[PDB]
């Protein structure tokens with residue numbers, strides 16, 4: 001595990017403005033998106049080969065509130081001016097949401113919770129994983145940016161609550177996604193310093209890795225044995241640039257659940273009838289590009305203790321197969337955190353509150369990413385998740401809400417009631433309280449008060465768009481590595497999986513080429 005230490009910006013020595021035309025040329029690999037998967041992928045490929053990493057955002061030093069736990073709220077409260085690290089969107093379902101626009105991707109703006117994948121996930125996928133190498137690669141990530149959290153009073157209250165509510169067993173401190181209650185890792189260190197995927201660029205070879213920032217990749221270029229041969233990208237001034245791969249080298253899209261399918265569709269990889277309807281020339285028909293896009297529901301209550309509670313980062317997890325639960329203790333604010341609640345029309349907290357949360361696994365409900373512009377990658381795509389379209393998801397939310405009621409009735413949580421009465425009506429709530437306990441009362445609560453967990457995934461799935469080598473089927477020299485790749489969450493908190501996956505696939509590419 002990592003130690004408490006400053007955020008390591010050594011890598012800025014090989015970070016350049018995309019306005020620099022001397023970056024245009026031929027590389028062994030081009031990685032699109034300097035994010036959770038892309039940064040460890042590019043660093044790994046750079047051990048042997050010449051790599052260009054292209055990121056649309058700027059460097060995290062421009063937005064210092066991205067570098068502390070205390071700055072998390074600021075990034076979500078900040079107005080989206082096109083340049084900020086948080087890009088705001090609303091799904092077609094009407095649920096507010098965010099994605100990252102910054103070198104380091106979503107590991108620069110996220111809640112810092114670190115977990116390994118459920119060890120059963122690898123067999124569930126039917127991919128031939130090198131499991132020894134998966135674990136070596138988890139340790140490579142953890143040694144860089146993961147700490148054992150110190151005790152925080154509220155996380156300890158919630159952990160005692162989860163155990164008293166029957167979320168057993170007590171796993172103590174563990175990075176593994178296992179049934180029961182545990183202290184997990186964090187990418188915040190014990191001084192509140194954020195550590196993130198950009199720091200994994202410090203593991204790259206500085207003679208072989210180049211990083212362009214404010215590089216908006218608009219199009220994947222193809223041969224005229226269809227192969228990806230390069231990219232077009234625009235700089236902050238609006239000027240265009242090209243970069244190519246050479247010989248046995250490859251383009252990898254790491255632009256996230258939203259950005260990957262967007263760029264594939266803009267580049268003519270996707271459903272023939274849809275792309276022909278936009279007069280986008282089809283290079284490779286695949287009816288699944290932008291399909292099977294998922295967002296795990298977040299359902300929640302907010303309690304307002306009569307005495308102040310200490311603000312905390314999330315470190316204590318209550319895991320069952322059918323729901324994943326945490327709680328944050330949150331300082332009050334008068335400017336909303338965009339997407340913390342599902343719409344801007346949510347009450348503001350006047351005092352410290354506990355946000356007590358359950359996540360639906362999978363989920364089984366899915367939707368799609370479609371283009372909003374047939375030409376401009378800077379124009380956000382349309383995204384729809386179809387929350388609770390699958391009844392199994394709704395049943396799982398009912399089970400999770402019953403368990404949050406159990407948590408609120410524990411001796412652990414009793415001291416946080418406003419009134420010493422028998423029920424959970426003894427708490428004071430911000431927003432809608434929990435349930436009458438008939439299925440319809442819990443289903444109404446689940447459906448009406450859903451928010452994003454921010455763990456959306458899918459849109460370029462293995463088994464639909466990709467093979468088990470993460471290659472785009474029917475195309476040479478093109479791969480996809482990021483959260484677009486799997487339909488079900490690997491665990492409650494997937495950044496650890498996707499950090500591992502960038503390096504893992506980098507190591508597979510290097511091996512396939514030897």
Ligand SMILES: Cc1cc2nc3c(=O)[nH]c(=O)nc-3n(C[C@H](O)[C@H](O)[C@H](O)COP(=O)(O)OP(=O)(O)OC[C@H]3O[C@@H](n4cnc5c(N)ncnc54)[C@H](O)[C@@H]3O)c2cc1C
Nearest residue numbers: 033035036037056105106111112113217259483493494495
């Ligand atoms: C608010 C929030 C809180 C979260 N908290 C947690 C948590 O505590 N723990 C956890 O495990 N997970 C958490 N997650 C989820 C997790 O961080 C993400 O699922 C994961 O980081 C996604 O990784 P990715 O590589 O797919 O995408 P990203 O990290 O978003 O990387 C994609 C990158 O591509 C860039 N890009 C996109 N399009 C282009 C383009 N055309 N050209 C160039 N660059 C482009 C983007 O700017 C970005 O930097 C959180 C998510 C959010 C949004």
Ligand SMILES: *[C@@H]1O[C@H](CO)[C@@H](O[C@@H]2O[C@H](CO)[C@@H](O)[C@H](O)[C@H]2NC(C)=O)[C@H](O)[C@H]1NC(C)=O
Nearest residue numbers: 118119120121124177178179319320321322361
């Ligand atoms: C870890 O992943 C495994 C495999 O996906 C899960 O096991 C499955 O769980 C469902 C229960 O909802 C069962 O119907 C399947 O039979 C299980 N598969 C196997 C291989 O046993 C497991 O639930 C996940 N664990 C947690 C804690 O999330």
Ligand SMILES: CC1(C)OCc2cc([C@@H](O)C#N)ccc2O1
Nearest residue numbers: 111314326328329330355357453
């Ligand atoms: C504002 C506040 C309390 O802070 C951080 C936070 C983290 C999580 C986490 O599980 C994820 N992802 C859920 C909710 C949440 O809300």
Ligand SMILES: *[C@@H]1O[C@H](CO)[C@@H](O)[C@H](O)[C@H]1NC(C)=O
Nearest residue numbers: 003004005006190191192193
């Ligand atoms: C962590 O903060 C403490 C103060 O509580 C200090 O003693 C220690 O040197 C700090 N380490 C850092 C900032 O790296």
Ligand SMILES: *[C@@H]1O[C@H](CO)[C@@H](O)[C@H](O)[C@H]1NC(C)=O
Nearest residue numbers: 017019058059213214236237
């Ligand atoms: C890149 O250069 C342009 C001016 O050419 C400037 O406006 C922009 O801020 C620079 N971007 C970064 C990320 O340095």
Ligand SMILES: *[C@@H]1O[C@H](CO)[C@@H](O)[C@H](O)[C@H]1NC(C)=O
Nearest residue numbers: 116119131132134135175176
């Ligand atoms: C990998 O690590 C997990 C714990 O994260 C462990 O349970 C598993 O046995 C390890 N697998 C291999 C192949 O060593």
Ligand SMILES: *[C@@H]1O[C@H](CO)[C@@H](O)[C@H](O)[C@H]1NC(C)=O
Nearest residue numbers: 274275276277278279280374
């Ligand atoms: C596609 O181009 C044809 C002309 O070739 C035109 O008739 C049609 O309306 C166009 N469709 C779109 C959506 O641009």
Ligand SMILES: *[C@@H]1O[C@H](CO)[C@@H](O)[C@H](O)[C@H]1NC(C)=O
Nearest residue numbers: 363364365389390391392393
């Ligand atoms: C729910 O999801 C599963 C597929 O994972 C499927 O068997 C079932 O048909 C789905 N229900 C609906 C309404 O789609």
